[PDB]
Amino acid sequence: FVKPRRPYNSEGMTRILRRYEEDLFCTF
Amino acid sequence: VTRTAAHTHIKGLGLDESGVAKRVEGGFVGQIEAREACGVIVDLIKAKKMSGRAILLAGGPSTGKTALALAISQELGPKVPFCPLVGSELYSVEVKKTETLMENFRRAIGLRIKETKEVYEGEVTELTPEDAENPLGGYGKTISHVIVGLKSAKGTKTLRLDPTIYESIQREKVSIGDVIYIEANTGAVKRVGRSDAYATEFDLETEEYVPLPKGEVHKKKEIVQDVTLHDLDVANARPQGGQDVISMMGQLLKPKKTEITEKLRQEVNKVVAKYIDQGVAELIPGVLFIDEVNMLDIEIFTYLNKALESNIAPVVVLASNRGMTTVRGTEDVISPHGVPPDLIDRLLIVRTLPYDKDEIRTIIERRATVERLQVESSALDLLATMGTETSLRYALQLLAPCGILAQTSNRKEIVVNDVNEAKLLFLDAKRSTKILETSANYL
Amino acid sequence: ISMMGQLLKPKKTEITEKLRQEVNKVVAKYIDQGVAELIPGVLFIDEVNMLDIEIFTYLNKALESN
Amino acid sequence: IYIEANTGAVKRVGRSDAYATEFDLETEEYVPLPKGEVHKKKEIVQDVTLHDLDVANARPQGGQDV
Amino acid sequence: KSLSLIAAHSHITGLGLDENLQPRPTSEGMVGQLQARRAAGVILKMVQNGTIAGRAVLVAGPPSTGKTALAMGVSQSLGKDVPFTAIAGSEIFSLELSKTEALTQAFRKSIGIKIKEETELIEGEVVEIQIDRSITGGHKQGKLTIKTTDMETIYELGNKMIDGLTKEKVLAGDVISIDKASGKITKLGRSFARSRFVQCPEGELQKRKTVVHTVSLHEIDVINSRTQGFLALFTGDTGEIRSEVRDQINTKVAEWKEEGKAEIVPGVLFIDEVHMLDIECFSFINRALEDEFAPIVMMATNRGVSKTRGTNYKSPHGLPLDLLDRSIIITTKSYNEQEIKTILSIRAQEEEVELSSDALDLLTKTGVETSLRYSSNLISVAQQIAMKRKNNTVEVEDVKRAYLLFLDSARSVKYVQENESQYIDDQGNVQISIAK
Amino acid sequence: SLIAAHSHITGLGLDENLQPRPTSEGMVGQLQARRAAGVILKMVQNGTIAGRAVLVAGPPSTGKTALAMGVSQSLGKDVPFTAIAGSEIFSLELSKTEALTQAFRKSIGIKIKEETELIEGEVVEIQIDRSITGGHKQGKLTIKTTDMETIYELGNKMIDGLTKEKVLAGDVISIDKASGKITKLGRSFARSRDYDAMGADTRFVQCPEGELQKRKTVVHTVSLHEIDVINSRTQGFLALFTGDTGEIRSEVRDQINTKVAEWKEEGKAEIVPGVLFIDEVHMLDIECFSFINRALEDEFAPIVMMATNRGVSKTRGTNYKSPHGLPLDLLDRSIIITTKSYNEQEIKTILSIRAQEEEVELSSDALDLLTKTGVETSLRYSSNLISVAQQIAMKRKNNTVEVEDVKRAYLLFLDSARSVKYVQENESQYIDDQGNVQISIA
Amino acid sequence: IEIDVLCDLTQRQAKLYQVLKSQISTNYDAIENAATNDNLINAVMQFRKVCNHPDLFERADVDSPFSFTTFGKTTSKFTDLIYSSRNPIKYSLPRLIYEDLILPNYNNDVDIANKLKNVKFNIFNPSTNYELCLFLSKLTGEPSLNEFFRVSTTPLLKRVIERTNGPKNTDSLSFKTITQELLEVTRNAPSEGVMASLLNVEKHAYEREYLNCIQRGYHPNVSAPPVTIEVLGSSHVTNSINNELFDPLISQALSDIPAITQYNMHVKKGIPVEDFPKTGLFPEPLNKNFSSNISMPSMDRFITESAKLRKLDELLVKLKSEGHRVLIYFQMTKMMDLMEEYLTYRQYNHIRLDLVHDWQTNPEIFVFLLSTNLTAADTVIFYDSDWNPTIDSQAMDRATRQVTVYRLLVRGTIEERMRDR
Numbered sequence A: 001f002v003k004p005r006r007p008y009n010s011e012g013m014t015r016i017l018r019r020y021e022e023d024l025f026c027t028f
Numbered sequence B: 001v002t003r004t005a006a007h008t009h010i011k012g013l014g015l016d017e018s019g020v021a022k023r024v025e026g027g028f029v030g031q032i033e034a035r036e037a038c039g040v041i042v043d044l045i046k047a048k049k050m051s052g053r054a055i056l057l058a059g060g061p062s063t064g065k066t067a068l069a070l071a072i073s074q075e076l077g078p079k080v081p082f083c084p085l086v087g088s089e090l091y092s093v094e095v096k097k098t099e100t101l102m103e104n105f106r107r108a109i110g111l112r113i114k115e116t117k118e119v120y121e122g123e124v125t126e127l128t129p130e131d132a133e134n135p136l137g138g139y140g141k142t143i144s145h146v147i148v149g150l151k152s153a154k155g156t157k158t159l160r161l162d163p164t165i166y167e168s169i170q171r172e173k174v175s176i177g178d179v180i181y182i183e184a185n186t187g188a189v190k191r192v193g194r195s196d197a198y199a200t201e202f203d204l205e206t207e208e209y210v211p212l213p214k215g216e217v218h219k220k221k222e223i224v225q226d227v228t229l230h231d232l233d234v235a236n237a238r239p240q241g242g243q244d245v246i247s248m249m250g251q252l253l254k255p256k257k258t259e260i261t262e263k264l265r266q267e268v269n270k271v272v273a274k275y276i277d278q279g280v281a282e283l284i285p286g287v288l289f290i291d292e293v294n295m296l297d298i299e300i301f302t303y304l305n306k307a308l309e310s311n312i313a314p315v316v317v318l319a320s321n322r323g324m325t326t327v328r329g330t331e332d333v334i335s336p337h338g339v340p341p342d343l344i345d346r347l348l349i350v351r352t353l354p355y356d357k358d359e360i361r362t363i364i365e366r367r368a369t370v371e372r373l374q375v376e377s378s379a380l381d382l383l384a385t386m387g388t389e390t391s392l393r394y395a396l397q398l399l400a401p402c403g404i405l406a407q408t409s410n411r412k413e414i415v416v417n418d419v420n421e422a423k424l425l426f427l428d429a430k431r432s433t434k435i436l437e438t439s440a441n442y443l
Numbered sequence C: 001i002s003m004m005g006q007l008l009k010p011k012k013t014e015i016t017e018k019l020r021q022e023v024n025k026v027v028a029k030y031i032d033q034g035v036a037e038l039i040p041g042v043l044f045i046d047e048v049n050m051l052d053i054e055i056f057t058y059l060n061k062a063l064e065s066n
Numbered sequence D: 001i002y003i004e005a006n007t008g009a010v011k012r013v014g015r016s017d018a019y020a021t022e023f024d025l026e027t028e029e030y031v032p033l034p035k036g037e038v039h040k041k042k043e044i045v046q047d048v049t050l051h052d053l054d055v056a057n058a059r060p061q062g063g064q065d066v
Numbered sequence E: 001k002s003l004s005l006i007a008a009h010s011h012i013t014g015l016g017l018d019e020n021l022q023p024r025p026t027s028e029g030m031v032g033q034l035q036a037r038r039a040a041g042v043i044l045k046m047v048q049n050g051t052i053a054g055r056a057v058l059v060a061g062p063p064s065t066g067k068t069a070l071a072m073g074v075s076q077s078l079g080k081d082v083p084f085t086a087i088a089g090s091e092i093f094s095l096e097l098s099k100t101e102a103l104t105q106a107f108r109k110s111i112g113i114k115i116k117e118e119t120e121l122i123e124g125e126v127v128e129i130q131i132d133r134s135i136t137g138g139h140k141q142g143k144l145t146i147k148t149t150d151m152e153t154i155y156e157l158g159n160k161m162i163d164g165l166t167k168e169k170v171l172a173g174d175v176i177s178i179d180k181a182s183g184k185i186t187k188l189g190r191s192f193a194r195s196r197f198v199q200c201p202e203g204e205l206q207k208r209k210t211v212v213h214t215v216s217l218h219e220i221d222v223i224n225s226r227t228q229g230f231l232a233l234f235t236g237d238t239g240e241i242r243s244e245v246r247d248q249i250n251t252k253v254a255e256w257k258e259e260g261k262a263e264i265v266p267g268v269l270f271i272d273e274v275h276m277l278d279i280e281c282f283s284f285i286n287r288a289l290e291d292e293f294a295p296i297v298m299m300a301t302n303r304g305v306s307k308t309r310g311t312n313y314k315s316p317h318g319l320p321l322d323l324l325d326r327s328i329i330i331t332t333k334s335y336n337e338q339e340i341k342t343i344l345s346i347r348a349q350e351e352e353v354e355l356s357s358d359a360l361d362l363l364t365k366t367g368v369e370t371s372l373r374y375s376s377n378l379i380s381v382a383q384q385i386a387m388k389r390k391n392n393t394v395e396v397e398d399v400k401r402a403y404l405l406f407l408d409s410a411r412s413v414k415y416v417q418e419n420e421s422q423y424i425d426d427q428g429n430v431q432i433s434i435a436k
Numbered sequence F: 001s002l003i004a005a006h007s008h009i010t011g012l013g014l015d016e017n018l019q020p021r022p023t024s025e026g027m028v029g030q031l032q033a034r035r036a037a038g039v040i041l042k043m044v045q046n047g048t049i050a051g052r053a054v055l056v057a058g059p060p061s062t063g064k065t066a067l068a069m070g071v072s073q074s075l076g077k078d079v080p081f082t083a084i085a086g087s088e089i090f091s092l093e094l095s096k097t098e099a100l101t102q103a104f105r106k107s108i109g110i111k112i113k114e115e116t117e118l119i120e121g122e123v124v125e126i127q128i129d130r131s132i133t134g135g136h137k138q139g140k141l142t143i144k145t146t147d148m149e150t151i152y153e154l155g156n157k158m159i160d161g162l163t164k165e166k167v168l169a170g171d172v173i174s175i176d177k178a179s180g181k182i183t184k185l186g187r188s189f190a191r192s193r194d195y196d197a198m199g200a201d202t203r204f205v206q207c208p209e210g211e212l213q214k215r216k217t218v219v220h221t222v223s224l225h226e227i228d229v230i231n232s233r234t235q236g237f238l239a240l241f242t243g244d245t246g247e248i249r250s251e252v253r254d255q256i257n258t259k260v261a262e263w264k265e266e267g268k269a270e271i272v273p274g275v276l277f278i279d280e281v282h283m284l285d286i287e288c289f290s291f292i293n294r295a296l297e298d299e300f301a302p303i304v305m306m307a308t309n310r311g312v313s314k315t316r317g318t319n320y321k322s323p324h325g326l327p328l329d330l331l332d333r334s335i336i337i338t339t340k341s342y343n344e345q346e347i348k349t350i351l352s353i354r355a356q357e358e359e360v361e362l363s364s365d366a367l368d369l370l371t372k373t374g375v376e377t378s379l380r381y382s383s384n385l386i387s388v389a390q391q392i393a394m395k396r397k398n399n400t401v402e403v404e405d406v407k408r409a410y411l412l413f414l415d416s417a418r419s420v421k422y423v424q425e426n427e428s429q430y431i432d433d434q435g436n437v438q439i440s441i442a
Numbered sequence G: 001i002e003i004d005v006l007c008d009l010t011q012r013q014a015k016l017y018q019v020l021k022s023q024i025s026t027n028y029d030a031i032e033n034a035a036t037n038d039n040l041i042n043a044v045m046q047f048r049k050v051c052n053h054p055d056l057f058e059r060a061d062v063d064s065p066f067s068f069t070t071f072g073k074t075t076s077k078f079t080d081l082i083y084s085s086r087n088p089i090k091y092s093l094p095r096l097i098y099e100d101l102i103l104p105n106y107n108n109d110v111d112i113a114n115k116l117k118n119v120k121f122n123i124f125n126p127s128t129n130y131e132l133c134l135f136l137s138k139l140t141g142e143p144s145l146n147e148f149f150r151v152s153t154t155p156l157l158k159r160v161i162e163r164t165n166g167p168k169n170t171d172s173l174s175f176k177t178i179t180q181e182l183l184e185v186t187r188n189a190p191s192e193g194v195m196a197s198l199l200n201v202e203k204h205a206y207e208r209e210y211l212n213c214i215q216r217g218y219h220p221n222v223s224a225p226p227v228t229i230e231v232l233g234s235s236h237v238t239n240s241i242n243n244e245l246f247d248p249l250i251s252q253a254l255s256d257i258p259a260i261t262q263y264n265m266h267v268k269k270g271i272p273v274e275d276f277p278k279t280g281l282f283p284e285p286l287n288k289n290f291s292s293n294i295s296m297p298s299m300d301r302f303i304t305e306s307a308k309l310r311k312l313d314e315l316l317v318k319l320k321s322e323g324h325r326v327l328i329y330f331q332m333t334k335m336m337d338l339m340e341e342y343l344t345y346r347q348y349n350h351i352r353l354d355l356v357h358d359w360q361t362n363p364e365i366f367v368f369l370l371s372t373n374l375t376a377a378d379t380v381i382f383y384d385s386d387w388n389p390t391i392d393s394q395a396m397d398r399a400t401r402q403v404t405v406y407r408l409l410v411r412g413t414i415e416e417r418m419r420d421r
């Protein structure tokens, strides 16, 4: 079989997001 | 294949069971009385009963004193600590020479302890912090306790942590799904790596992947550890390995030798006596070898005069080349071997004789067999005549350029022309001195 | 320890040759691009009879350098 | 407690003797109640030297008060 | 006891003296030097009196005559908690402390203060613990049952005892000591339960215990200096403790002695090879013994009309005339044959050597012709030769073998003097070549 | 770079038979010393022999340092060559034995093999989750080539390396997984939506092909002293550059010796040796000689090359005199290569090589007079005069350098013997050894 | 058809051999003759146990420093773990010293003289020394005149922690040195710039030397906490020592705040970001390998600890393509080591001591270990270094119509004597 991915905990922190079209910044 | 360096041919003293020695065994040639004396010394050493004994390996240059010291170390074994030293190494700019000598004295005495370790290890499944009701109260910390969940192989337990243990946890930078190793002795944590149950083909930090630790959590394991008393003195003078702020600031500061007081050594002695009385630790005294003891000044000999009277001080062997030579640091006191007459009374001088022509020949033959050189009989005899004419060491150190010239001339055996060319290219001390005396522009 | 050293006294430390070598290498690399220009400058030592023999031996070694 | 009015030093002697049986065993050092007046005033003389002052306000690393 | 192997002075257990300070011919491991032993007994009584401060005595004589043996006898017969500082002469030359302040530290380490204090301590065998956790953990109450060989009681625990009992995990069957004032628990060990082992303590818990503390004045000087913690007592980085903290300590211990809360315990400073000190250190020794809080200083030297270090001239005992004027001199004499024989028999007794009478007389003769430390080194190595031939008794052939293998001073001097060309002289000339 | 005094040597000038040419690789003459240095070079290149001291001796202005730098150029790449002089040993924070041990451990090398993954592709998106204070940094990366598209998790160090060299989407970057390198090779999308803040003009690159991850094996060389400083304290890498490595303990040395032996037995690391060169060895102390005597006999000990120009003189720290300024026990362990002074033909060839390197054209008669002046006083004097004759010639606006130019240079700049003869005639003008002088004219 | 392989001796093997040779002694030549003819037999088996594997002598657990600690040890829903390490050396101070010389008291003068030396006679006091404060405010350019008195009376490391200051007067004598200009340039700057790459060469040396993946070489031998001071009868000493060792500002400074606590603090309780205590000031260690002194026993190192095992694993690397079988022979306990070996690193089909005939029918499986007719096996791999060739003949009585004998041997040991005789 295929092993699962590690659990990614993203709670409580700001997010900087960069994608192909346009850039984001979700802050608290 | 294997790197040879100087007296690598020595495998031991090469004695027999009755206390006698054969002529060519153990890598040695000759010096039968010195070998038997060093065998009696190493038997005394293995008896582990006397303290503050001292011998002297006296003799000329190129005679085998350092060879005898290395033979003693090989006859002793790895568990007994051998602390090689030169007389010039005691002059440090950070600390007085007396404290360097006492640190080496404590470095010679070994110790072997069996230790019990309480170990919490496993995979972090969950990790939640519990905040305080007044995080900016100024007193206490921003969290209160932390619950962490570790599962080993065939086991699972939830741990509730005080902020100091979790401070070490976040200093080692764990995450969810990593294999960790909490040592409950000091609070030290080691991050083993990611668990390999998850996918291991997506990280970008060359992280190692480790299976689950076998057995339950809260293990108790026995570790045998070999330490010296100098390690105890250093670790108590510069305290690291705790989780308070002094141990944390002690790692980052610059290390520096300090004059360790006598009270610390006495407290370490009391604690090691308690460890011995518990039956968990045994005392292993060792050796300390001050090669070129003539380099010490009168102050180090004055301190040795008192430091050999200690009940824990080891057996110390010395070497010297000097004859009737004035002591360094004094003006008119002339003494044998550069050693003052107060230290000579505590000493037990082991003389070492010079070599003959055939002994030089078999020493050169053994050095050729050690270096993987093949030498014909005529070139070996010529090298023996050169050894008796110029010096032994100039004959031993000329085997390598004849080897280079041999592999230059597409041969393996060393012909007489090769040692003649090596005579021509490289000079000994005496021919170069005669060149010095017959030149004008200070060649 | 960085702010500890920044607020403390700047004690002069023996700079190793390795740092000098990487500085010279990167300086020559940016010389090769043409974006920098190295200008040598004259050093003046007054009453050089006052120097020790150790200083003269290091002066010899530095004069044979690049 | 201990409070000095001029300096402001606060020193905690320990818990009172009348509060000793709230628990049968606890770490609180139970000191008895002081037998004198709460407020005590007396005058002293402080013999210092000039050098005491110069080492007081010239510290390479401060924090002599704590 | 501590870590104690066989040393050179291990057989000494004190001064073999009666109640009238008359030395026994052989007592307490020390034999010979009757006048020196009586003088050291007088100095011992002077220390035990405690009314005399800052006296300097000097033991002088030939080497291997027992000056260090006499000082070790004084050190062993002082007792415990009376301070004794033993330093070599080459120790005060420091790269981070001045020589006079190192002498001040060595002076003040040997004066101790004696404070008696009483504390309540709870030391018993724990029957069982019982702690009930709350709904969340805001308040934790629990009960604790401890016992002795006599008594048995149950205690109600508050928050802090439960927090101090979870830390240092205490189970049923443990024997612990609870300090009520400081909240400190120490695990003495597990009791006699078969399932480290220590017997269950006796009854009468909450008992009064008096512990007598002896602290040297150097520790109080380091403590009272606010820039130095007590960790300078172990790491050894004190860094020239100033004079005002020392004078503050001197006045404070004086007022403690007059108040009645403490008692001054004077001690002995012993300086090995005092001739290695320099002239300014001698000057500080001259003007430092005047102080009331000063020990009784023992100096041992063997040099005779030598140069003084740091000056060009020569003075008796390697010491200037004013320091010899300030000191009283104990002279040690050499040993005859019988005293050397008894010393060798005592040393062989301590090193666990069973040796023949004729081999003993041979070692005695070697100790008469050559100095005593050569024979004392020879006994143990001859015993190793004796076990090498599987004999438990040391014979005459073992002593002859040890003589043949390990050289003494005079034979090595002769053997160098006949073959001086092989070694290295003062000019660094050596003939390594063996032929032509 | 700049031109130096030993720049003409580009090797050692010997054949495969260890036979020197009359003039090869910028070196002329000195046939026996060149053959001996080639023998020592081959003995270093074998590598199985350790701790052998070689002492080069001769008169000044002969080519001992020239022979040493020739050995250095012929030593090949990735082999250490610690060239210090005699006076760097004396220090205020290092002991003499410790400074010597640091030199010895600088001179010997470890070649470590590592395994490295190469990832290169266009970046689809970057998601970075930083904490409120910016301390904790975690996130995901989505890199892509034309054949497959994979998503990686990022750590703290990779994200911190991503912030510098700001990586927009559609940027072709190269990731080295082991070294932690980020190399933006260019931008491949050229998006219409362009930010007016950003000023980057990175070049257009082709989209990468093939597999995304590539395994490669790399080798790098690090000396024993570097690993000693690295393992000595926490911030050892900064002390590698600032030199604040104060008296490393012996326990560190024993453990790194055992560790590099373990790395050797695994096939992971290889130990190559080196040449430690000391120039003006007589400047050392006697305790330095004793420690060299007892430290050449260790397993990790390089082939020490030793240079002196001095005859029988006083050995420092002692009251006697010894040959070469070195005591006899160190001379016992050392094999001596001797060097000889030059004739007029070798000095002419040296000056021709120097002039051909220094971009100076000389006539035949100017070369003959330079050869005569070099054989008269010293070779270094004429080698210096080539420069000022060149500068006088370009001040006279002629390309070649003539006899009159070198005569004006000889008149203008003095040598040793002429300055001695000018000092001795005018002894009242200069300050004497007793500090007596007359500054007044009359 | 006839292969005898020879292996050298590793460093741990040589260390165990030389400690056994020095400790046991008892005529090692006669011990060699004892191993020739076959207590003495216990010495011969223990020498062979050293010859086979270090872990056959003693299991190599974690390599950690000696914990010079006394702490709460178990003598044998959650079980809470609390830090309790202490130095076994206990320094005892009487209460008289502490309560008379260090703490304030009515008969003491420590608070009075301390105020008089720190506040009243301070030269930075603006109440009595305003001219000097204004002088230094001209020189340094501080906006606040109480900065000098506050700086002179703080502990230095607390001054390090509370140092973050950006407004400065521009009409001052504090200057921006060329080095400081260059530092402000390389505060934040990317690659391919001349002025930043000429000053970031430490990071270039770190990156080009592959130095983030170098393994740790040295760990300390003993780790010890600071010496515990014990004062009997006073809780003020315990509170002061607990405050000193575990200062919340400083312990908060060398650590971090959990991200959930930061989110619950800033957003939910409305704490501003500047009001957070300062964190993240612990220096970053060189790699992940230098993070802690405990070294986990590498299973890769277990192969290279024994030279016989390393040559066997290399032989299996060459011989995975073909089917063979392995004999572990007369030695006990080597079975579970090889068992753990191939079920820890390199997972192989195997069978270990019916099912024998079941593997005889299965061609793809490799048998590996067995102890001391089987003609279905294509190749038997074994030692041949045994005293009794009758044991060899009984072993090869097991014996596909092919044999290819490989004989495992270690050099520089008693095994070579065994082989010769």
Ligand SMILES: Nc1ncnc2c1ncn2[C@@H]1O[C@H](COP(=O)(O)OP(=O)(O)O)[C@@H](O)[C@H]1O
Residues within 6 Å of the ligand: B006, B007, B008, B009, B027, B028, B029, B030, B031, B060, B061, B062, B063, B064, B065, B066, B067, B068, B363, B396, F297
């Ligand atoms: N008895 C001996 N047998 C074989 N080689 C010897 C013997 N004595 C000395 N040597 C050789 O002589 C050289 C010098 O010996 P060493 O003890 O290191 O210095 P020294 O002889 O000056 O004390 C060494 O290379 C050693 O191999």
Ligand SMILES: Nc1ncnc2c1ncn2[C@@H]1O[C@H](COP(=O)(O)OP(=O)(O)O)[C@@H](O)[C@H]1O
Residues within 6 Å of the ligand: E008, E009, E029, E030, E031, E032, E033, E062, E063, E064, E065, E066, E067, E068, E069, E070, E343, E372, E373, E376
């Ligand atoms: N009276 C004595 N009783 C017992 N042992 C003695 C006596 N005198 C000397 N010794 C022993 O002689 C040895 C050397 O004497 P030592 O005290 O070193 O002389 P010195 O004080 O002159 O250096 C020591 O081992 C010591 O134990």
Ligand SMILES: Nc1ncnc2c1ncn2[C@@H]1O[C@H](COP(=O)(O)OP(=O)(O)O)[C@@H](O)[C@H]1O
Residues within 6 Å of the ligand: F005, F006, F009, F026, F027, F028, F029, F030, F059, F060, F061, F062, F063, F064, F065, F066, F067, F309, F350, F379, F380
């Ligand atoms: N064989 C040679 N090849 C090249 N240059 C040489 C040669 N011999 C001498 N030189 C030059 O002579 C000068 C003196 O040589 P060097 O060894 O540096 O000083 P010294 O000979 O005084 O020790 C150097 O500048 C060197 O360039």
